[PDB]
Design a protein around this ligand. Sequence first.
Ligand SMILES: C[C@@H]1C[C@H]2[C@@H]3CCC4=CC(=O)C=C[C@]4(C)[C@@]3(F)[C@@H](O)C[C@]2(C)[C@@]1(O)C(=O)CO
Lengths: 243, 11
Amino acid sequence: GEFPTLISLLEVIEPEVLYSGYDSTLPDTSTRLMSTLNRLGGRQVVSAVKWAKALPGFRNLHLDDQMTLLQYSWMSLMAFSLGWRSYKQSNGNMLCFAPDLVINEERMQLPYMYDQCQQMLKISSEFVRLQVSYDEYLCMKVLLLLSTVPKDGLKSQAVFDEIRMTYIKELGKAIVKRNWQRFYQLTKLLDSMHEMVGGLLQFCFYTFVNKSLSVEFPEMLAEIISNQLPKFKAGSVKPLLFH
Amino acid sequence: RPAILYALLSS
Ligand SMILES: C[C@@H]1C[C@H]2[C@@H]3CCC4=CC(=O)C=C[C@]4(C)[C@@]3(F)[C@@H](O)C[C@]2(C)[C@@]1(O)C(=O)CO
């Protein structure tokens, strides 16, 4: 027979790019822009729950574990994909949040935008610097989902460890499909994602609690952010680093 | 527990 490759499977469960429906006819405010991004983000996260579910192995975790991983890593998954789309669609020059919603120079210049957009372009330019391939990206994306765990560790740490084993192998296969040196670089990029995202989480928590700014969040994200917020205060959240 | 997320996982 010949089981289809795990790469080929990842390729087909990769979600299709969502659409913002952003109306560039009305005037650009920064509360408006951020509230849009959050709404779009809400949708991307739903799209990412579907993806995780179709993910060979993911389902064998305890439901607590699936929660924990999706809660702890959503912002990384989203920023990673964003970085990818910006890499493809504009070669890392502009944030391509959707095809109907790109960030240009007006709207990076809007209040609050420049800082946060700088950080997300950093992610983008890594893909540029390392000429990352689609297959490399897909495996790295799975490893991102599996990169943050409670300091307590997970319930079914058993299954957890074997899942990482698989996708680390998969990452290696992908490196090949496109040479010892490469795997180092990539696991270093995975490592450096924790820092690159920490800033985004910080600003996110700010716009979430700052009542004056009237940045709206979909109930999807709000529920996650509200749950995550005491856990980051306690600092009870462990990055898995390769180095 | 994030009710919508939990929900999406249990369907
Ligand atoms: C700087 C932060 C990080 C941002 C997120 C970065 C990752 C991401 C990628 C997308 O393609 C869609 C939305 C999200 C998931 C995001 F873009 C929005 O949600 C807005 C966001 C949280 C942020 O802009 C805010 O906190 C604004 O309130």
